[PDB]
Design a binder for these strands. Structure first.
Ligand code: MG
Lengths: 137, 94, 82
RNA sequence: UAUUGGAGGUAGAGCACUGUUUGGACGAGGGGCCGGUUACCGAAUUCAGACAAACUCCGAAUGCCAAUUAAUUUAACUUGGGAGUCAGAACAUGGGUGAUAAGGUCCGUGUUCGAAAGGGAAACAGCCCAGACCACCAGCUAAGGUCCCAAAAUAUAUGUUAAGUGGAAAAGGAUGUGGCGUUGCCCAGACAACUAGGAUGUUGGCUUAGAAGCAGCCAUCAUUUAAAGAGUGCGUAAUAGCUCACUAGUCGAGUGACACUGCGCCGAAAAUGUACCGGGGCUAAACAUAUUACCGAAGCUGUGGAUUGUCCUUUGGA
RNA sequence: CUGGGGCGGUCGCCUCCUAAAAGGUAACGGAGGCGCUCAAAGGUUCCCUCAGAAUGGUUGGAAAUCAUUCAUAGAGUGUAAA
RNA sequence: UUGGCACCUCGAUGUCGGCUCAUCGCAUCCUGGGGCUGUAGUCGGUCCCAAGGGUUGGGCUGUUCGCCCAUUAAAGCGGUA
RNA sequence: UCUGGUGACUAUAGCAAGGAGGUCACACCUGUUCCCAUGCCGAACACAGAAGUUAAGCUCCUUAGCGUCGAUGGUAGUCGAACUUACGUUCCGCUAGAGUAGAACGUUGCCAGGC
């Protein structure tokens, strides 16, 4: 869950960060889930930090599903350059999120362990989150 | 399985709908064999109690006017953040 | 002003004022272009012709009416009563 | 503007195409080997998920073009004489660029300033309200306001805050406080310290530096018992173990948790002098929801007066 | 021209996106092409339908050609893109 | 600090070091009060309150800086065109 | 409404399946001598003929597997407004896409023989 293997157009217009989650608002694979309540970017490197924390905290226990994939590339201009002269080069890959977009899913592990793991993941992550269970009823 | 409802009326604006949802009730519609397209609203808590009482599927008595309609939930809407039910669809079997 | 950094994409053509040129209901004289296009976004219908440039022009005088052909195709017509 | 008719593919959605992608089925190719088996790995084929300025089976709002046509308004075009303009600006909103930087830069769409006085924003071209023909020591209001500076409510009702919050931040942190549910327990008497017992064959087994709630596998058996665990637990040189598993009884009413909220708290350090209310000051003179007044402009009325235009002739009034 | 000059790059045409569903619309913004070619790759008349996939096989580098049912054109259209 | 922007100043706003004179902030170098510690006291480390005062003389470079030699309780960091 | 031409409609018209039927119309069929016939077959195309047979194409009838269509309610978005500087809030019109109920195994014009 790091980078797209290939993209057609490598320099792209930045994403819209205003509105609500187009989809992925439900726990489908796992049992418990973690959704977001604000809307920032995710940079293919903070989710890496988060899945490590969760996985290593479960001690290779139950399964994990990352629901957010970093698709959008972003650019940064070289240091101390003036304005103009083209667009800069790719610095990282991102995936915008929206309030209500589930991010991580877990199953095959007790409820309290899952809540603790998703808590520890939440702090390595730049968006306010919430703990959710597989919606039923 | 003896839930009751109330009959919706025409041109319920955004403000009316959102006020109605902000109180302990939720709009819905019924359709299917044996009836017509009647738009009603139900109190959320009793809907939830009935559903946990009967489950996903249940031939439910539904209170409209004076007539009770054998009805089951075709399908429903939910708001994941601010947990609250949004719109219930009902089909009658009879 | 920066320095040597340069881009390989600063080029474009001049847009061609294509699209519609008349609307349903107005009286067009014969020859009036109704829809400059490429390929066939709209096929000619009654009393309408196809130029070499896929342009659509009325054959005769009359009113103009856009209509449906089949499922996913549109034509154009001209009718003379005026 | 109302009503018809139409072109087009944005917002939003969607994955049917080009791709980009996360899990799960399912048989199989080079190949682990002897063409091989099985793992797989390159895909075929499915089921559930998602992402897109240069993807679209779909697809608004609004804009635009035009009408057999209505209703209200008053421009519009052609020809000729005279020009000035080619440095724009800020706000709001859709986008590019930059760093979802700039009082940045480049476009689109309003407005304003430019070329605009007046009231509000302390002061403050671009914000809010409003366009100054000229009097008047007349009246009504808009934005903003009504304890004093300083014209008007120390108005009325119902609630919220306790921080001077109001009158600058954030992730996070918290028995701050108010509301609405949901809830598991409780006169059989949950919850406190209820000073009431606390240990047994027994560390049994691996017993580990010997280590008997600590360097680590726990095999963690019934209860001496109203309440009991090869010890809830503070310990690590073995260990010395009372107390919130647990309630009769000190005695007698309540007491874990959960949501979703309204208002505060902490995070919070900068340079001449308070100095992040304009000052005083304010526990309402803050905030929320109603209601009723009043102040407030060069806006709009009232009276008088110029000067032009279009009407009636009321050759005068409009 | 130039986010001051200089250095580097660019200058005319076509296509696409940015471009806000008419048209138009800028930046040293994001992508590519052109300075030709065709006496048939023109006109007209009459005919014919494709890529791939397996049920596969004399070859079988796999798939050359051949066979058969599906193939919405996934193919072709002299060239860039629409 | 290195920059980005080009908004005042080109009918002129002297730009770097040093000297003289300072003045103010505190994210405190010393001194004063404390919580601590893997603090026995001296030792040190860490954090908090603290800005009243104090916070050297030289060798080398135009140097700021930095290194070095001796001291000191300390030889603080910045604003001030 | 049969049957065959012909053409009008957004596949409510189509695909697949099962089942009939050949009412003299329809295809199947016998052959290449005859015009013609094919870069390469009487394959087709054309042609002379009608002895065989509905098996298939065709026709009619069923069925929603499959295809398409598809509301109401809503939600997203947004025109205008009022707050506002919030990855905003409120009000008022308009109102998707997706999904769900459902429609649907066509309607139909002229002509010629039918009945
Ligand atoms: Mg001067």
């Amino acid at each position: 869950m790091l980078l797209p293997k290939r993209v057609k157009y490598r320099r792209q217009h930045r994403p819209k960060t205003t509105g609500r989650s187009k989809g992925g608002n439900y726990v489908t694979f796992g049992e418990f889930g973690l959704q977001a309540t604000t809307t920032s970017w995710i940079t293919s490197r903070q989710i890496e930090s988060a899945r490590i924390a969760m996985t290593r905290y479960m001690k290779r226990g139950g399964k994990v599903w990352i629901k957010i994939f970093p698709h959008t590339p972003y650019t940064k201009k070289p240091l101390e350059v003036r304005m103009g002269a083209g667009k800069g080069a790719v610095e990282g890959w991102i995936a915008v999120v929206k309030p209500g977009r589930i991010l991580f899913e877990v199953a095959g592990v007790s409820e309290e362990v899952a809540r603790e793991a998703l808590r520890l993941a939440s702090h390595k992550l730049p968006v306010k989150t919430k703990f959710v269970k597989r919606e039923e009823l | 399985a003896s839930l009751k409802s109330i009959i919706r009326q025409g041109k319920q604006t955004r403000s009316d709908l959102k006020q109605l949802r902000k109180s302990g009730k939720v709009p819905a519609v019924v359709y299917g064999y044996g009836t017509k397209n009647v738009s009603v609203k139900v109190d959320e808590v009793e809907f939830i109690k009935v559903i946990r009482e009967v489950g996903r599927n249940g031939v439910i008595e539904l209170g409209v006017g004076s007539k009770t309609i054998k009805v089951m939930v075709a399908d429903y809407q939910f708001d994941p953040l601010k947990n609250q039910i949004t719109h219930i669809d009902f089909l009658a079997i009879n | 002003k920066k320095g040597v950094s340069s881009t390989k994409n600063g080029r474009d053509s001049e847009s061609k004022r294509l699209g519609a040129k008349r609307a349903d209901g107005q009286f067009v004289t014969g020859g009036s272009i109704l829809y400059r296009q490429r390929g066939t976004k709209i096929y000619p219908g009654e009393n309408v012709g196809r130029g070499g440039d896929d342009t659509l022009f009325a054959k005769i005088d009359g009113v103009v009416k856009f209509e449906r052909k089949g499922r996913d195709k549109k034509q154009v017509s001209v009718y003379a009563v005026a």
